[model samples]
Target: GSQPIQLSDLQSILATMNVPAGPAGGQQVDLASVLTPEIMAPILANADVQERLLPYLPSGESLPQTADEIQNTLTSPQFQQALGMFSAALASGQLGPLMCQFGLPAEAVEAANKGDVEAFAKAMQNNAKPEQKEGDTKDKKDEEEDMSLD
Candidate 1:
């Protein structure tokens, strides 16, 4: 049996890493269709999506402090759906451009683009941002400064 990391685990790790969570809000699109360049082209090109998401990239805090906020802000839902879509797409030979869009490495992305579910999962899990166990390094630095002043 292989150790598989769940989407929840990925989210937790992402929270710790401070990477912007993936896409959060949108009408539920057919994930399989959405991964296509035709559908994704709009999302990738939309200024609103870019503005809403750009700031969060690479960091946005662990959680939103309330369930509603979490619902409103986190892209966990979309990512989970995307993961499922990715799996299906891999099987059907319909996921190349999607992988490239996500910026996955060429080889891994190529496999994913070709609809290799197992390989896609491996790449996503492996490439997930590393988790942080405690406060950010910047916080630690600030603490040190306080110590000096005190």
Candidate 2:
């Protein structure tokens, strides 16, 4: 029988999938990018996400703090590291059942349950604003056109 996955190989695969390779190598597929300070400000302000997330924040702090602290938490290294780890774990195919606990979209839960990182990426991409996707599509088309003049 095939042996269980080795940690080394898992690390390698996660490294490749977790971050885009380029001159700007720091960019990662983590919540830090998706939930930027500006984006998180309003979400943290919202009663629902706040209610769910506030209880988990460091103790001895106000339940609903200012936007500044929200930004701070989103940008904090501890949160970033945790988010990175979560992203890797999600991509590793083990978080399917755990992901289902949250009321995520059906497509997202399906992808998570299947441990399909590409599908999860697609689902998240689909959630992006239409205008952003349109811009991305136009950029890709322009890049393709530029490469075709060979």
Candidate 3:
């Protein structure tokens, strides 16, 4: 049941987040389809900081509706699993190599704050190779029928 979240799911979420419009306009353009592997890996790996840094995000009279829309977009099962992976990695001290491998260096937030959206997106997209589903478990029948077991 704990299957790793897939890349396509991440892409869809990114599409929602990178949309151009907010409450300011009636239609918000979806950017998820454009999310590359380089852009999503690192962000998904560190989503825990989102709330603490939300104050720094752009704000205005239309902000609440925009925030609500973003919130809705992020509440999907795939998003939760990705955020969980980030939190689990941090809690278990597994985020270091992941951060490095994704090109985040030591200043991911700083880079993001400097308007390096591409860099940030790249970092988020390359953290870990998605787990393969086939190798996760053995079939019960196969295990039981193995002659070597006797």
Tell how far residue 35 is off in model 3, in angstroms.
6.8
Could you give candidate 1's per-residue lDDT for residues 36-126 as a string of tens digits? 3333333334333233333343233332323344334334554444334334544565545655664645645566456555454444344
Pick out the ten consecutive residues of candidate 2 with the lowest summed lDDT: 131-140
Clashing pairs for model 1 are 18-59, 19-58, 19-59, 20-58, 20-59, 90-115, 95-113, 96-113
Of the pair 1 and 3, which is ahead by lDDT? 1
Q: Which stretches of candidate 3 lie over 4 Å from their true place?
A: 1-60, 65-69, 73-108, 128-150
Better of 1 and 3 by TM-score: 1
Give the clashing residue pairs of candidate 2, or none: none
Reference-based lDDT, each prediction: 0.43, 0.51, 0.41
Candidate 3 Cα lDDT to native: 0.41
After TM-score superposition, the amount by which residue 62's alpha carbon in candidate 3 deviates from its true location, in angstroms, is 2.4
Candidate 3: tens digits of C-alpha lDDT, residues 1-150: 688778687777665654475555332222243443234444543444333223333233222222334445454544334333333334333344444444555545433344343443445445434445676565554544456653
Q: What is the lDDT of residue 31 in candidate 3?
A: 24
**lDDT by residue for model 2 (32-143), tens:** 5444566445434444433444435434444435556656676665445433443455555344554445444565556656655556555555676433534444533444
